Design a protein around this ligand. Structure first.
Ligand code: B12
Ligand SMILES: C[C@H]1O[C@@H](n2cnc3c(N)ncnc32)[C@H](O)[C@@H]1O
Ligand code: MET
Ligand code: SF4
Ligand SMILES: [K+]
Length: 658
């Protein structure tokens, strides 16, 4: 038969869902099923030469192209086309340009591009290859080096009734392949397709600004059971806005029941709906109780009205955000908020003010920031919009590498009309410090106390930290701010400094963290937290000196001394023993205060008895074991770990009046 090869490389093990969807949809044509021999998908990373050599006698080479695999898959296609002149090279995925232009001049070894959702176009291509391509909807066809655009794509109907690659068993080989090689994997799952909104930076599922289409109910329920029956522990749901549809609560309950009855799945990653509502809360409560929840998305991208207008995004208001934070915090349900640095119209002033406003509104635990990437088919990637807002980009490698044509690259915004490059660098350093100091707890409780009892706003506190300590190179915190300043300037100037391995690519920063573990995906956030952990006592000595510059010398303020001791003691330290615990005495009931109660000068004994850390309590500290300390203190670098980390859980500690 005509051998069909799929290549869709992922750095982390994700099951090849696209290959399964395209094959099983196409196999509904009995002539296609009989004529074509679909090979096992290539989705685990291997050397380019080795991947090309594994493609033997191909009739069709199907490339599933994303920012993380486009260049290597083009190079494989180049090598395969040299060996097999008659192979049909078809590239789809969100990195395929909507407007190909001179694409085939750069990639003459590619024959057909598929745009957006690919089921119909791929099935029509395979059928046409058997018949006695420019008539196929949803594709562009190479003619010489020119791109001939075919008819517009045919989307699947509002109710998507297509074969499931999971239920048909065509994902079995990939699952076994991961397990044979000792790899944990994510199963990818869709319950619907599209996003109804229009954020200009986004290209979610190649289907933003789209009417929502649902996968049929019975297929989804059967797939839930399939995941549970096959011990698929890690499930990644691809929906843009989970909770946006009424049935999403029923889906959440069905996943919780499957977890309860069969033990799988164990964790569910999903992006929760932009217009967060009671259904998102009910889903989150359900999955929190079932230990499935990985954080409730309450993302903003920006808080500035001009920025939000420029990117066509409406957010929940700040006061409504505050009410959400209060409701989730009361249930101990973890939420997180994403921001993007360098959006149109964002100034360094508006960016820092927005960060402070989110802390003011009650998010102290989980703020996440991304560099703005220009995606090929995002609305922002037009000459008009790039010109309108003055977006300046630099090519940025994703990974440490090797020829340039095998290094994956994206275009990273690092300057706009509103944010000069220098302001971008300092703003990025600012939010990293907010993450490891505030989300990381080191100064979170001091900052809250200073805000609520001494009138020091959140933005002002962390601006002052940066302004003061950047002028003191020999301090713990000053060294971090200055190293981040040079790192991000090099990051702009040197494209090879990778997005996904930045800390690991710097020998000094990698050496800082070497006693704590061997990781390729250390974040700057992790690095700052562990650098402070290393020089913890001196950090607090120097912190007292910064407080004196605010007029708040602790040597004359007994209450400030008291909260500083609480702030020091609450942090998890390498010598902590779950068998011994950790206790101290204070002049105020700090646990009750930071739980939301009134500040009362009540002399207390606080006894910390933490046995484990992390979301599921699956990291146990071992005194003297820096590797076990790191897992309990900060968890994994990927995925982001912020539930149950950093500090002792004083809300459960034994607090006794003296
Ligand atoms: C799961 C996921 C991840 C996983 C990785 C998944 C993997 N390794 O395979 C993780 C969580 C690691 C991840 C990370 C990132 N992601 Co992501 N991710 C997704 C998500 C939610 C699902 C992808 C998926 O499997 N979809 C389901 C499949 C079935 O749908 P599909 O991709 O649209 O496929 C269809 C069509 O494209 C077409 N098609 C696809 N391949 C082919 C091939 C052929 C031959 C044909 C004919 C057709 C065809 O047919 C398919 C079926 O209809 C998407 C959004 C989404 N819902 O698609 C973003 C998405 C892929 N991610 C995106 C981005 C930008 C990233 C990051 C690089 C940056 C960021 N998020 O800020 C980071 C990584 C940063 C870092 N430090 O490394 C972009 C990618 C855009 C692009 N041009 O590549 C997306 C589209 C989201 C967005 N912001 O618009 N991601
Ligand atoms: C899922 C999350 O990914 C982030 N996100 C989406 N598109 C981009 C992009 N082009 N650049 C950077 N971050 C992005 C947003 O913060 C979104 O909430
Ligand atoms: C998938 S993007 C993050 C979730 C939601 N669509 C939002 O923008 O807030
Ligand atoms: S950021 Fe979220 S709401 Fe905005 S277009 Fe992307 S998926 Fe839709
Ligand atoms: K689009």
């Amino acid at each position: 038969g005509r051998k069909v090869y799929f290549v869709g490389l992922n750095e982390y093990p994700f099951l090849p869902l696209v290959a399964g969807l395209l094959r099983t949809y196409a196999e509904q044509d009995e002539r296609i099923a009989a004529a074509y021999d679909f090979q096992e998908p290539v989705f685990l990373v291997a050397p380019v030469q080795e991947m090309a050599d594994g493609i033997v006698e191909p009739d069709v080479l199907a490339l599933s192209c994303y920012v993380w695999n486009f260049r290597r898959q083009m190079k494989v296609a180049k090598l395969v086309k040299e060996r097999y002149p008659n192979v049909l090279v078809v590239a789809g995925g969100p990195h395929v340009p909507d407007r190909p232009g001179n694409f085939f001049e750069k990639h003459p070894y590619v024959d057909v591009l598929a745009h957006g959702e690919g089921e119909v176009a791929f099935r029509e291509l395979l059928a046409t290859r058997l018949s006695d391509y420019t008539a196929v909807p949803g594709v562009s066809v190479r003619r010489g080096t020119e791109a001939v655009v075919g008819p517009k794509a045919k989307r699947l109907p509002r109710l998507i009734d297509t074969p499931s690659p999971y239920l048909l068993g065509v994902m079995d080989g990939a699952v076994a392949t991961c397990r044979e090689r000792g790899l944990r994997f994510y199963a990818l799952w869709e319950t619907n397709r599209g996003c109804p909104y229009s954020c200009s930076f986004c290209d979610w599922g190649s289907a933003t600004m789209s009417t929502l289409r649902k996968f049929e109910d019975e297929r989804l329920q059967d797939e839930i059971e399939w995941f549970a029956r096959h011990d698929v522990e890690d499930l990644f749901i691809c929906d843009a806005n989970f909770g946006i549809m009424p049935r999403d609560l029923e889906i959440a309950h069905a996943l919780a029941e499957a977890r309860g009855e069969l033990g799988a799945p164990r964790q569910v990653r999903v992006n929760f709906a932009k217009n967060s509502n009671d259904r998102v809360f009910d889903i989150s409560k359900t999955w929190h109780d079932a230990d499935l929840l990985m954080g409730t998305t309450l993302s903003m991208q920006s808080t500035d009205m001009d920025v939000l207008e420029a990117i066509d995004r409406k957010n929940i208001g700040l006061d409504n955000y505050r009410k959400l934070q209060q409701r989730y915090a009361a249930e101990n349900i973890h939420t997180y908020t994403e921001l993007i640095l360098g959006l149109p119209m964002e100034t360094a002033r508006s960016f820092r003010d927005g960060i402070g406003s989110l802390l003011e509104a009650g998010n102290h635990e989980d703020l996440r920031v991304y560099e703005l990437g220009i995606l090929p088919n995002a609305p922002l990637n037009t000459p008009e919009k790039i010109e309108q807002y003055g977006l300046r980009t630099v090519p940025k490698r994703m990974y440490v590498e090797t020829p340039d044509d095998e290094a994956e690259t994206f275009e990273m915004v690092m300057e706009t009309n509103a944010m000069p490059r220098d302001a971008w660098v300092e703003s990025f350093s600012f939010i990293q410090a907010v993450q490891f100091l505030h989300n990381g707890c080191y100064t979170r409780y001091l900052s809250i106390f200073l805000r609520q009892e001494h009138g020091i706003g959140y933005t002002r506190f962390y601006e002052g930290l940066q302004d003061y300590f950047t002028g003191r190179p020999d301090t713990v915190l000053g060294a971090l701010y200055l190293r981040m300043r040079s790192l991000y300037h090099d990051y702009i100037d040197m494209p090879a400094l990778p997005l996904a391995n930045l800390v690991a690519s710097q020998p000094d920063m990698a050496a800082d963290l070497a006693p704590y573990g061997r990781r390729r995906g250390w974040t700057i956030d992790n690095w700052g937290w562990l650098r402070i952990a290393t020089d913890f006592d001196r950090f607090h000595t120097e912190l007292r000196e910064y407080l004196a510059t605010l007029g708040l010398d602790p040597a004359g303020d007994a209450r400030l001394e008291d909260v500083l001791r609480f702030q020091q003691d609450v942090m998890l330290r390498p010598d902590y023993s779950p068998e011994l615990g950790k206790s101290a005495e204070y002049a105020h009931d700090w646990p009750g205060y930071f739980a939301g109660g009134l500040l009362r000068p009540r002399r207390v004994r606080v006894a910390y008895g933490d046995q484990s850390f992390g979301a599921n309590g699956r990291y146990r500290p071992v005194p003297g074991d820096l590797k076990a300390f790191t897992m309990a203190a900060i968890g994994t670098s990927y995925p982001v770990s912020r539930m149950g980390h950093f500090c002792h859980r004083f809300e459960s500690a034994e607090v006794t009046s003296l």
